[PDB]
């Protein structure tokens, strides 16, 4: 139904080793389409999805300049955050930015984003109203105030409401056959006895796009989520994804309950039951 | 399509 466009940024300071690293990666939903790593032999905005090469030489040229500048912008920011956070030069630090927007089935803007993180923890995020800022601490408030005076939030709102919506709509259209194609999971359950009085029922889901999937193990009744173990939704390496969910069933008259799987690529939520 | 960073910290 819904669609999202994201631009992930990472700036890692490596003193004692050399100049910092800047890697910017773009995604349309769960598919990568662009890449700019400043640590490449010849840094350039490179295609990553087949449905992006149709963009003219100007697209690549303008994005490369934006990224070659952003690299120097993030350099200054790594220096500024040493002063702000009362940090020394010797240390190795990390700045992360998440840009982009979520759009509904009607192609209209649902939520806008402009988040920042310093050393794993949050820094400065743009509020849903696309007018106000949320500072993680009093050092981030210095950026909040620098940005409020310079009317930064207005510039973001312009991109998130405009530019980002228009480009997401173009990307989905070029990658129609892939980005907007329903790919359901390949379901099956695996049984293994953890002991003699206990066993494991692992519910497998493989080859599915998009990433969003719900796997719930229910023992007759719904609420059995507090004792079920599930992994992170992992990528297969060919656009499609994987995920399992294992519950520790006893031994006897117990291997009789079911598992439920929800994916937008499914016409109905599937229900699995194991038997040898 | 990514735009330039609006302003530094």
């Amino acid at each position, epitope marked *: 139904g819904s669609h999202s466009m994201r631009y992930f940024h990472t700036s890692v300071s490596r003193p004692g080793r050399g100049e910092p690293r800047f890697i910017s990666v773009g995604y349309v939903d769960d598919t990568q389409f662009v890449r700019f790593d400043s640590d490449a032999a010849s840094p350039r905005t490179e295609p990553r999805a087949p449905w992006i090469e149709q963009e003219g030489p100007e697209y690549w040229d*303008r*994005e490369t*300049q*934006i990224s*070659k*500048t952003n690299t*120097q*912008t993030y*350099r*200054e920011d790594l220096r500024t955050l040493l002063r702000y956070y009362n940090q020394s030069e010797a240390g190795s630090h990390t700045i992360q930015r998440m840009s982009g927007c979520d759009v509904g089935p009607d192609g209209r803007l649902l939520r806008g984003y402009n988040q920042f993180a310093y050393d794993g923890k949050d820094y400065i995020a743009l509020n849903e109203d696309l007018s106000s800022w949320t500072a993680a601490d009093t050092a981030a408030q210095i950026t909040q105030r620098k940005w409020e005076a*310079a*009317r*930064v939030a*207005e*510039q973001d709102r*312009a*991109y998130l409401e*405009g*530019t980002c919506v228009e480009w997401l709509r173009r990307y989905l259209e070029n990658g129609k056959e892939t980005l907007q194609r329903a790919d359901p999971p390949k379901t099956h359950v695996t049984h293994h006895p953890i002991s003699d009085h206990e066993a494991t029922l692992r519910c497998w889901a493989l080859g599915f796009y998009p990433a969003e999937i719900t796997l719930t193990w229910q023992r007759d009744g719904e609420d059995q989520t507090q004792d079920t173990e599930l992994v992170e939704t992992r990528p297969a390496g060919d656009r499609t994804f994987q995920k399992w969910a294992a519950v520790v069933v006893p031994s006897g008259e117990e291997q009789r309950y079911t598992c439920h799987v929800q994916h937008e690529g499914l016409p109905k939520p599937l229900t699995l039951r194991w038997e040898p | *399509f*990514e*735009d*330039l960073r*609006v*302003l*530094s910290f």
Partner: T-cell receptor
Amino acid sequence: GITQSPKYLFRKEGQNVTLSCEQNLNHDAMYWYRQDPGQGLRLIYYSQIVNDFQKGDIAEGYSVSREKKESFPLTVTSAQPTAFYLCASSMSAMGTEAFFGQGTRLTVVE
Amino acid sequence: QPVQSPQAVILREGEDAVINCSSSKALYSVHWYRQKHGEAPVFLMILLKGGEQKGHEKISASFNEKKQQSSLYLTASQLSYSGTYFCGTERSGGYQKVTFGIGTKLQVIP
């Protein structure tokens, strides 16, 4: 504010001169212009951050460097005649207001 | 690139002058500067949106629907209003530069 140096400057034939522009407002963006009657204001070089500067549209004959946030000096080489050079500097550009320097009058004296 | 409609105008003291400017590419913001030939252009106002703002008499500006075309209004024109009015245009990714065209040479006659 912004200090553009010098106010008045002469140049000999085939000579190179470096015009100064310094700020303390901690502005990220810096701009160099050339004013000529009928042509108006024209962007030589510009810089939105340290180490990064971009050309267009008046060059060759001009060279710049952005070693610090404070300074953006324009070096006018052996190519170009006589003109009035102005210098701007904005906090985050696009968006914010650009503040100017006094200006530089450059005449080529043979 | 930024086109200014009057380009040069001569008017009586107190007479109401209207300077117009337009673009082809949608701009994020429009700056208005006034300059005294061999001096630094003095900042008038900036417009980010999207309608009329602000109606501050003597020197007030308008920015059309969406977008490109912005006009400057001068009501009770005084002798100090004389000079070259410049329109500063700024564009989104990655055309972030303050662009000026041939400014309008406004002459107030006593």
